[PDB]
Design a protein around this ligand. Structure first.
Ligand SMILES: CO[C@@H]1O[C@@H](C)[C@@H](O)[C@@H](O)[C@@H]1O
Ligand SMILES: CO[C@@H]1O[C@@H](C)[C@@H](O)[C@@H](O)[C@@H]1O
Ligand SMILES: CO[C@@H]1O[C@@H](C)[C@@H](O)[C@@H](O)[C@@H]1O
Ligand SMILES: C[C@@H]1O[C@@H](O)[C@@H](O)[C@H](O)[C@@H]1O
Ligand SMILES: [Ca+2]
Ligand SMILES: [Ca+2]
Ligand SMILES: [Ca+2]
Ligand SMILES: [Ca+2]
Ligand SMILES: [Ca+2]
Ligand SMILES: [Ca+2]
Ligand SMILES: [Ca+2]
Ligand SMILES: [Ca+2]
Lengths: 114, 114, 114, 114
């Protein structure tokens, strides 16, 4: 099934944070309404925060995470969890290889902020 | 119910990252086997990362997050989610005041790394 | 934090299903817009499905789960998970005693249906 | 990503319950250590319970859920959620058609019991 695609409340600020855990350079692209809004790149096998940014969900609320390693798309997993009916996390894992740890790039989206 | 307490696989490296969304300084303590292993503090109303670190779960695997603001422990909410039976997230939200947004300090624990 | 309260899409059918795992008779009450819409009850230490029902979330979409044992309110834990941005589960555990297994009555809410 | 595969604690009872929301008969197979341990069949567009059972996770703790409709394997989505470090839910959705509602057979696994 489609993964790494979330519908947020419209015109709402959210945080997006990417972590790396692989030998190869991870490229994370965050798209809002089908247009790239942040990009982070880096290599780490120690969960380096390769980028964090505050974005606005815009008119559509559509947020999509894509991950690649030197041009090759990684396979994604994702889900959303809501705590106390108020606190939202959208979670992405990605796999660039064969070991299926799905941690090669890890992306966490959180809202609301402030 | 108890919140902010997670059993990790023993002797496993994990990532812990905290964000702030509140007027007051957040202090985040991360305990491993009931001893403080990391402490983060900072202030942001824009989801700033107030700390990130890699720790080991130790012999017991017992990890606990506690949050203090303005001299008092915040009310916690938490859950653990596992994606594709491989990728683990331990998620914590906290409330230091009256509005119940639960985002005042947000803590993300992830494993495995590497 | 408040637990057992979920905001569902307005005017939308959902399934609610309750399981029992305790020596005492569980009573599960499902409130829609602050009014009892369903009540399930039974006694099992083997996950008996003490009730299942389809309800409509109504104009507000507010849904609350309350559990009691021998006329005493059980402590609740809850969260909502969303799969592939489309499939929703609202999850409730409850504790009636001292062992903190939180499985004494378990309630699963699922939408959409059809 | 592989979906509908869960590692449970070894030799532990768990509940498995399946619901149907589709025009076609859903067949749900539950495998423990790669051997079929339960099979549920049924048809409903109203979230009817097509089966419920308690099974033992065995020496491996490997549990896999498979869903088919008239012999055709359904695409799965899944996750595991743990509340208060105690109560576990393994959640599965499936899609047999083109509408991607992923509720055609919904499977809920829960543990511990008792
Ligand atoms: C070559 O494999 C890549 O790098 C390794 C060090 C591991 O992080 C593995 O998960 C990843 O897919
Ligand atoms: C008396 O304690 C109650 O019954 C027992 C059989 C257990 O299921 C326990 O979790 C429950 O709280
Ligand atoms: C033919 O399509 C199947 O039956 C319909 C009644 C819907 O439940 C749909 O989601 C399902 O895939
Ligand atoms: C700016 C405000 O600061 C504190 O009062 C928080 O509890 C609120 O949620 C908000 O972040
Ligand atoms: Ca990998
Ligand atoms: Ca890796
Ligand atoms: Ca607050
Ligand atoms: Ca706040
Ligand atoms: Ca109990
Ligand atoms: Ca019990
Ligand atoms: Ca369908
Ligand atoms: Ca359907």
């Amino acid at each position: 099934a489609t993964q790494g695609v979330f519908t947020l409340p419209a015109n709402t600020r959210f945080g997006v944070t990417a972590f790396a855990n692989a030998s190869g350079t991870q490229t994370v692209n965050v798209l809002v309404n089908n247009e790239t809004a942040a990009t982070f790149s880096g290599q780490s096998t120690n969960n380096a925060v390769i980028g964090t940014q505050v974005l606005n969900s815009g008119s559509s609320g559509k947020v999509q995470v894509q991950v690649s390693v030197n041009g090759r798309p990684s396979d994604l997993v994702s889900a959303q969890v809501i705590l106390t009916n108020e606190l939202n996390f959208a979670l992405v894992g990605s796999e660039d290889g064969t070991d299926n740890d799905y941690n090669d790039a890890v992306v966490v989206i959180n809202w609301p902020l402030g």
